């Protein structure tokens, strides 16, 4: 490794991966550079790397990656003209220089949004020049997400390439390709949002809160590992997470690689499921391990009662190292419950903590805390019930109707949220139902936690930028442990003044018949939100009557001879009848 670091990276990563990562890396700093300029830099950097591979002692090959990268950045002629004060980073020595470059990454570069070309256009461009087509994908995404972990982008790119490879040869290219591009896009946005969320919550709630989350998550994953091993892993994972949040690619990657290396050298102390991951290339190890399914739980683990309720030295053991004792509780509880969300486990540990804090100061602590496990039962059943109720509702409704039930519900709880956000959130909330309810009960809560975190965070981001409800701000600014229950606790808004009727809002044209399924659904759901906003006291029942009238009306107007007029004409009377029925 140490000698020529660039040659070592090139040897470990291989040429293709090396070139792709260098491209991503430059694109994340030189966010305004044309694709051609980056290609040229990458080629120059790769040709240099090859000289160091041929001879570690070759000129400049003993410089650090940071030194070489920044030197190269500082050779961009238009640096000052295009990036202004970032060019001032070049006047600094290289620990300070990289830090300076790091600070000048732009989280919002004001580039035009990415647009999806026609399927035939995409597949043709892919065919004409696969390498260019894919490298453009890397470039365009990376420079819009300068902190997105480069290797993970590589994994997105490889699936992006696989979508095109398969689907551009398919019979129905679009039917193959589009859902795959939609999934990558959604996963991409989600991953990027989750990354920022975790780093934001790290600095807001502190390292201890993160460690607790990690103990719970790591214990679920590796239930056979000893506590001391989970605790070591929590320490290392915290350093990784902290340094990766700081945002330097190489520092983050080396931390992750070091952790992945340790995990792979200690599989017998950690998990029986890591063998395949640990055989993979260095580049993919940590990513692979991050996605590993939970190990099987050890057979016939005893109750937690003995150590955490019935032992005579609960209070003594607690008081000598509270976080360690609480970590042990959380470790024991989590390893036995891969079916819980991490946040539920944290509710249990917080409950236990509050009880020990209250009870251990009592004259007779054991009498005080003896039934603490009763206190867990309603906390556990709340998400379990909510899941049962929602999955049962999804099954009876199907996804679209499920989204509409949510739409009506949430519009009534928080009517001042913009229509498109209510639509988006409700639609996405329906998708988590569609996805997570396909799991047996044992896996539903972690699924829902994962996907709810995406959907609820997206809502909070939108709400941060354009706030309308103190209640939503409260839930969004609360602990992540209480985020979801806070939202669940939202009550119908009874102070809400109905939105004035707008004619155009409830006016429909024959274009509605030719819209895609999605386009039609969003148009219908948009009106449904507006209907609730105009008539918040309308019941599910009364709404269903208007909705059934509307549904008949569109089925009618879309198919029976020369017809934009019914849409106007029946539109007049559907509206009138609805207005009276909800009047
Ligand atoms: C290049 C693929 C595509 O053009 C597509 O058609 O799906 C596309 C891809 C992506 N985005 C887009 O808005 C569009 C177009 O809306 C946002 C976005 C965020 C990403 C992220 N944070 C990480 C990784 C990949 C991402 N990809 C996309
Ligand atoms: C000067 C060119 C710099 C090229 C950037 C190389 C980036 C290497 C990161 C890949 C290591 C991944 C480790 C991991 O995530 O487990
Ligand atoms: C060395 C192991 C560190 C474990 C830290 C103690 C865990 C206590 C759980 C309390 C729950 C807090 C959750 C939170 O703050 O978001
Ligand atoms: C509206 C879509 C519902 C999706 C499935 C129901 C999920 C209910 C909340 C589950 C708990 C998430 C994690 C937690 O708070 O403990
Ligand atoms: C703009 C209003 C946002 C809607 C509030 C989000 C509520 C999500 C809570 C988790 C969903 C649980 C299932 C349910 O709806 O009962
Ligand atoms: C007060 C004017 C009411 C006009 C009719 C409003 C229709 C709202 C959208 C109906 C959504 C139904 C969606 C569906 O079931 O396919």
UniProtKB/Swiss-Prot annotation:
Residues bound to Zn(2+): 66, 246, 248
Disulfide-bond pairs as recorded: 52-61, 74-90, 89-100, 123-168, 167-176, 199-245, 244-252, 264-278, 277-288, 315-360, 359-368, 391-437, 436-447, 460-476, 475-486, 513-558, 557-566
Chain ranges of the Albumin domain: 1-185, 186-378, 379-576
UniProt modified residues of type Phosphoserine: 4, 57, 64, 272, 418, 488
Sites carrying sugar chains: 11, 50, 136, 161, 198, 224, 232, 275, 280, 312, 316-317, 322, 350, 377, 412, 438, 443, 493, 524, 533, 535, 544, 572
Domain of life of the native organism: Eukaryota
Modified residues (N6-methyllysine): 533
Site positions (Not glycated): 3, 19, 40, 63, 72, 92, 105, 135, 158, 173, 180, 189, 194, 204, 211, 239, 261, 273, 285, 358, 371, 388, 401, 413, 431, 435, 465, 474, 499, 518, 523, 537, 540, 556, 559, 563, 573
UniProt modification remark: Glycated in diabetic patients.
PROSITE patterns in alphabetical order: ALBUMIN_1, ALBUMIN_2
Outcome reported for the amino acid change (mutating residue 312 to N): In Canterbury/New Guinea/Tagliacozzo/Cuneo/Cooperstown
One protein family per Pfam: Serum_albumin
Residue numbers binding (4Z,15Z)-bilirubin IXalpha: 239
Record-linked SUPFAM superfamilies: Serum albumin-like (SSF48552)
Annotated phenotype, changing residue 562 to N: In Fukuoka-1/Paris-2
Reported effect, residue 371 to E: In Naskapi/Mersin/Komagome-1
Residues marked Aspirin-acetylated lysine (site): 198
Annotated consequence of substituting residue 2 to Q: In Nagasaki-3
Result after altering residue 357 to K: In Coari I/Porto Alegre
Tissues and organs where the protein is expressed, per its UniProt entry: Plasma.
Disease entry from the Swiss-Prot or TrEMBL record: Hyperthyroxinemia, familial dysalbuminemic: A disorder characterized by abnormally elevated levels of total serum thyroxine (T4) in euthyroid patients. It is due to abnormal serum albumin that binds T4 with enhanced affinity. Analbuminemia: A rare autosomal recessive disorder manifested by the presence of a very low amount of circulating serum albumin. Affected individuals manifest mild edema, hypotension, fatigue, and, occasionally, lower body lipodystrophy (mainly in adult females). The most common biochemical finding is hyperlipidemia, with a significant increase in the total and LDL cholesterol concentrations, but normal concentrations of HDL cholesterol and triglycerides.
PANTHER family: ALBUMIN, SERUM ALBUMIN-RELATED
Protein name, as recorded: Albumin
Gene name per UniProt: ALB
